[PDB]
Design a binder for this molecule. Structure first.
Ligand code: ATP
Ligand code: ATP
Ligand code: GDP
Ligand code: GDP
Lengths: 448, 447, 87, 54, 101
């Protein structure tokens, strides 16, 4: 249907013309429709968070202490996005949150939580309540690689009235457990787990010591969240924020040990000698690590930070202080330059509805950062409270689960792409640069 | 500490004086503090929904189609209250909702959901998704009393890609099942179930046919909700609303079969010959059923409906030229009804914990929640996003009704502590006795 | 009776309390009859309110909001919208 | 009449610090340098649509 | 750091272009960021009040009778600025205020 989709009349305004004048906000323009020959469910919305990380869902949770901690990052990664753990915390806390995200989903669980036989049931209940993991292994001396003695699961202790009793009293004993011997392929081990109708399958050496552990919950998560953002080992992707001071070097090291996939630099004005040196140092010291630099709003800043070695750029400044830039113009200009140099960009700021996210992605951003839009969801940090007959969080109003909100944004982006007439947002960006996706500036009156 | 708690100076206004001049709303008055020698957690807030039903939580979900269906009634009963299933539906739908509430929690499950061996896995998945019950029994001919062939649980089907396969392929088969033989006491059966580490325990006769079923989920629910409102058989209490037309008689019959514990009459003005006749007929035909009559706002209406045989009264009215301010209505009707041994339900104008506390204190035994619980997850309707708000269909999301009920509970406890009495029964009695006192507030003092 | 040398008057979780002028009058009259002075604590927002509270029986008045934001209060000053507020 | 803003000394210091911070973000270490580079076209601006002013 | 500070792409609008159209207020435009290699405490804000007077603080108190008298002019000068004594007064009063400063 190329004859029907390709515009020859081209009745509309190209992005280049639209942004060649005063600085624009998202409400200043609208995107013209194209040609439709597909259902909205078939639209691909993925974008590059960084040079090497593609996100099925082009959404990133902002690294504000009111938005992103372990739970939010987990939720984002599960739906195909990613979260950035905030840095308003110590190195140890941030590393722990990163670990919580990374070790939530696994194939072979390599350091299974394990206890000694004499530990009270209270300890297992506390483990489940705090860290949310069942299937605790009982081993020699409590070592995660010790001799396997038994396993404790939900139904093993849910009826015990004396919480101080040792787990050995109620654990399922090793002699009665289905297990496997190292080595085994993950596919075979998980098939054995499915057939066994049990929740866990330890993998042991010839000395019956614990090598690793498979969890049925991982298979169920894979089924219920088929688009999860995953690294090579089957863990969820996780990102973390840091400033560019010399102290933060230590932080980065800790984060690298915690297993972050992306480091995100935290600065209102990232075109600094400190940030350039920091990017150089990180790329030298942790080559496996990808760096998101910023924030920037102009191509000159982008040039300096890409020269330093940035793998992506956060765009936004102002989204009093007399320095900044209208966000739609900033996104278009910086994204166009960075893309010309092979670097994707993240829209950070002023994204307050689905239409704004769609426009930001269309005019050049590969992914979008969500702050206010997801504040107040269940997965954000903070405690709920009732006030004036309202369920606020400490304040913002409750928006429910972020999973449903992410799905809603996904469907809206798909529908917008359909109306625009392209089956992917990569195609939309390309055709925008090509002049086949067209716009109209809107008079102030037309904005009502 | 009677010398310190008993008021002799009595610096304040008694309820009888407070309500003796003009119709009052809840904002027109405040309750004066008393003496405290206990922590708020020790406060008993229970009230009588009806002559024979005591509720640990004096809260009742209103029978509006936007508030109370099976899920809401389940939540209310679990937290120690009760729900009234609306009647804006057919007799069959209302009976099904009641049955859903009554059979959610059990001891021995008498009619366990069962399927034949050839049923597709998709059907069991549909059962779990719609009705939320696992541990489906597979028996000869799919009858709940048929010969037991196997059982299907979460882990038996969570991995199968072909949903059209018969359950016989993946079920846990009878020869490998832990079971028990009729007859058995519930305590022993549940202990055996716990020791077995399984989720279900069928109970069969000597012919291996299914007699009943024990579920571990019942024990866990009992553990997590120790104050649930329960009948003699361990089911949750459930109430249902009905009009007083002759047709509605059929409705009542259906509801009685579904097992409602309380019938709630639906009328803006319940002092009618139709409602009087209806109450007489219900008490004659279904003596086990308790009836909440109303709505009424005056003692004359209350007299007629209590004479008819009502077990409780709904208070509240306010087409526009007839009604009564709700605080006065509650005080007057509750005082008369209590003098005749009948409890009352405050229905209307309860918009915060202070209003509920005042309504209970001035004579209401329990309070009906409408707007206050609209928009909670358990209400009927689907959620939708609009302007980044997550409304439900025209109300804002309030989260789980369970957390809200706990919040209301704690607020009532704190109010009672400030008043200086350890139960709301004591508060009401001392109100009638003149030991719990009030102050009317000038319009300016209300800011 | 316990041995208090003075009383703080004021209340007004939401369903229990009392309008403050009545509270001051009643409590102050009783306490004075027993030789005990009283402190008006709450709802004093201007000089007229303080005068009335003292006149109807309070011996002294407690100042909260009325003196919040003075230089001597705890907290650091900051400029916002050209106003010089304190946190 | 106008509302009390306290000492003008503290206000002057506040303005000083703000001007310094703005100059830093602009990327020049003096306002003479800022003016010169403005005339030279090395300090750049963006006109803001009426909508962008919210 | 001249290679990093000097803009060659020049992604932005010069003052000359910005002011070549309708008359603008301060809210009509924003200043784009550049390159940072110094701490804010090192920034010099001085400007010339006149051909021969350099002010460490480029601030001048307006000569309105509600703003500047001896005390305000003293405060401005002490902080590195200057004040302008208003003229809604007699010669003698204005001279006395000047002497006080
Ligand atoms: N591989 C295994 N071999 C033998 N027994 C096992 C094995 N895995 C689990 N069990 C036992 O089976 C029973 C599982 O009950 P339970 O429902 O609590 O586990 P689960 O549902 O798989 O995970 P959860 O702890 O989250 O409930 C327990 O007695 C447990 O000790
Ligand atoms: N009384 C029993 N005796 C033997 N096996 C049983 C019995 N009841 C259930 N099973 C089987 O044991 C395993 C239980 O797995 P599952 O984790 O799904 O149980 P459950 O969590 O208690 O039930 P559900 O989660 O579906 O409500 C299944 O294979 C099930 O068919
Ligand atoms: N027994 C068990 N362990 C798990 C499970 N899921 C993840 N784990 C592992 O349990 C470990 C938790 O480590 P933890 O003690 O909480 O980290 P700490 O904060 O340093 O003490 C991690 O090595 C996880 O990989 C599970 O389902 N069962
Ligand atoms: N197998 C099983 N059955 C249950 C459980 N809990 C309740 N039930 C029974 O499941 C039955 C469901 O009734 P149903 O035939 O579906 O009524 P319908 O909705 O009108 O079709 C009820 O009779 C309950 O008693 C459970 O945990 N497991």
């Amino acid at each position: 249907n190329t004859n029907l989709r390709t515009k020859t009349l081209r009745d509309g305004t190209t992005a280049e013309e639209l942004f060649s004048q005063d600085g624009l906000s998202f409400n200043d323009f609208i995107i013209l429709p194209g040609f439709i020959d597909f259902d909205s469910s078939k639209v691909n919305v993925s974008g590059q968070f960084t040079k090497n990380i593609l996100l099925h869902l082009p959404l990133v949770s902002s690294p504000m202490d009111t938005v992103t901690e372990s739970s939010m990052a987990r939720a984002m990664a599960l739906m195909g996005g990613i979260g950035v753990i905030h840095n308003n915390c110590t190195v140890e806390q941030q590393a722990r949150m990163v670990r919580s995200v990374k070790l939530y989903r696994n194939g072979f669980i390599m350091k299974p939580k394990s206890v000694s036989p004499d530990v009270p049931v209270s300890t297992i209940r506390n483990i489940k309540s705090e860290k949310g993991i069942s299937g605790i292994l009982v081993t020699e001396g409590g070592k995660y690689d010790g001799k396997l003695l038994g396993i404790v699961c939900t139904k093993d202790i849910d009826f015990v009235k004396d919480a101080s009793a040792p787990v050995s009293q109620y654990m399922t004993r090793r002699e009665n457990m289905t297990v496997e011997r190292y080595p085994i392929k993950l596919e075979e081990a998980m098939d054995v787990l499915n057939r066994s109708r049990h929740g866990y399958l330890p993998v042991l050496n010839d000395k019956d010591e614990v090598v690793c552990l498979c969890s049925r919950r991982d298979a169920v998560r894979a089924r219920d969240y088929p688009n999860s953002s995953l690294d090579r080992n089957g863990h969820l992707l996780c990102a973390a924020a840091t400033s560019t001071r010399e102290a933060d070097k230590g932080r980065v090291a800790a984060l690298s040990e915690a297993g972050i996939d992306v480091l995100v630099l935290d600065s209102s004005q990232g075109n600094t000698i400190y940030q350039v040196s920091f990017i150089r140092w990180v790329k030298k010291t942790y080559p496996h690590l990808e760096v998101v630099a910023g924030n920037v709003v102009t191509q000159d800043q982008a040039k300096n930070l890409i020269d330093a070695g940035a793998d992506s750029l956060r765009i936004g400044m102002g989204s009093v202080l007399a320095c900044g830039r209208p966000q739609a113009t900033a996104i278009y200009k910086v994204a166009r330059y960075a893309a010309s140099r092979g670097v994707p960009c993240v829209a950070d700021g002023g994204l307050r509805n689905v239409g704004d996210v769609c426009k930001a992605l269309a005019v050049g951003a590969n992914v979008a950062m969500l702050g206010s839009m997801i504040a107040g969801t269940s997965e954000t940090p903070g405690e709920y409270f009732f006030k004036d007959g309202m369920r606020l969080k400490g304040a913002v109003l409750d928006k429910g689960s972020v999973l449903k909100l992410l799905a809603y944004i996904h469907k809206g982006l798909q529908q917008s792409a359909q109306d625009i007439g392209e089956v992917s947002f990569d195609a939309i960006r390309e055709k925008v640069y090509e002049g086949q996706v067209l716009f109209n500036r809107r008079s102030l009156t037309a904005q009502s």
